[PDB]
Write a protein that binds this ligand. Structure first.
Ligand SMILES: [Ca+2]
Ligand SMILES: [Ca+2]
Ligand SMILES: [Ca+2]
Lengths: 207, 199
């Protein structure tokens, strides 16, 4: 394949979709996890897929990847560092990680990734009035290089990568989660998706 | 209207250009102000010109703006809080604003806005091999609505606004300025320059 050219004025829709994703993340956190939070998500940068290792942080990173099996295809990678992993695990289990991460804790990390990821993708799907099916998440806990190596398996190298920084700020609490999200859609399918939203939005001038 | 087309893959060049802006701000702060700082881009977003007031936040804020009369044309607007303006003035003059934000402080802020603005614009311009002829930025303290209405005069409602959150973090110091930057290039002019760009 699909064409890769887009009108530059339509890039505002990327920002609109990201905010729609953040709003649904907040809604999912309340519905599924009983967590009441402000969720701020912002585009940090646009990078090439192979550059993602340098964008993650420097120790042991937790990551969950899903493949999109409907437009815009490609992959979606959620990552976070140890401080955030601890906050998630403690909040979602009512137990301390002081003595090491138990299975209750690791399972909470995986499920929290599923709530955050499906919330974000569902937000976008809602705005587009279309489903965006997601594959089974694959979890990798390791250094950046290894995460990137696994995450870029079967991914078009000339894709645009959108790097998002997200803060999940729990209300009436000092708990916060810091996440770094990598959107790696097929670039042609992504162009077409943005064009579709632009068409639907232009048509509101017919109402 | 003619389509103004960008290769979706070259959005990476927008990130790179903004980083060249940041780097030049940091070098110019050292050369022209004797201030040693890291200039970091916290976010890079896309909004319609009509929505910039909402990205500014409420009450009275400070703004530095300039309109280019050369390619890529358009408008550069920087907004920051009253408190940030005081921190800039104090860093530059070495005197607190607790006895007033004086004319000295105003001059020092102007000089800082001069450095930040030209640093950013010229960093981007050098990479794009564009030379830019422009006035010193107009610095004003006012409500976001007034600032937005002034910056948006002679700007097309369908242009792309690139909004950046930047942090100027002074080395060996806990002083840091949060600045929000709005770039509203002439979109025609901007797509032509991106289409010709490779590193
Ligand atoms: Ca809180
Ligand atoms: Ca349109
Ligand atoms: Ca510092």
């Amino acid at each position: 394949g699909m064409p890769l050219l887009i009108d530059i004025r339509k890039l505002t829709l990327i920002t609109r979709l990201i905010q729609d994703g953040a709003e649904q993340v907040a809604d999912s956190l309340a519905t599924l996890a009983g967590v009441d939070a402000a969720v701020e998500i912002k585009s940090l940068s646009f990078v090439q897929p192979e550059d993602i290792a340098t964008e993650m942080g420097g120790g042991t990173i937790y990551s969950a990847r899903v493949r999109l099996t409907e437009p815009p295809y490609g992959v979606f990678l959620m990552t976070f560092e140890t401080e955030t992993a601890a906050e998630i695990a403690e909040l979602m289990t009512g137990s301390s990680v002081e003595d090491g991460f138990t299975q209750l804790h690791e399972s909470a990390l995986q499920e929290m990734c599923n709530i955050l990821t499906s919330g974000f993708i569902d937000g976008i799907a809602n705005t587009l009035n279309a489903t965006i099916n997601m594959g089974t998440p694959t979890v990798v806990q390791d250094d950046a290089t290894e995460i990137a190596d696994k995450a870029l398996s079967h991914v078009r190298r000339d894709s645009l990568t959108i790097v998002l920084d997200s803060l999940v700020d729990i209300k009436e609490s000092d708990v916060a989660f810091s996440l770094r999200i990598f959107l790696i859609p097929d670039p042609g399918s992504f162009v077409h998706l943005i064009d579709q939203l632009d068409y639907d939005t232009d048509r509101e001038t017919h109402i």
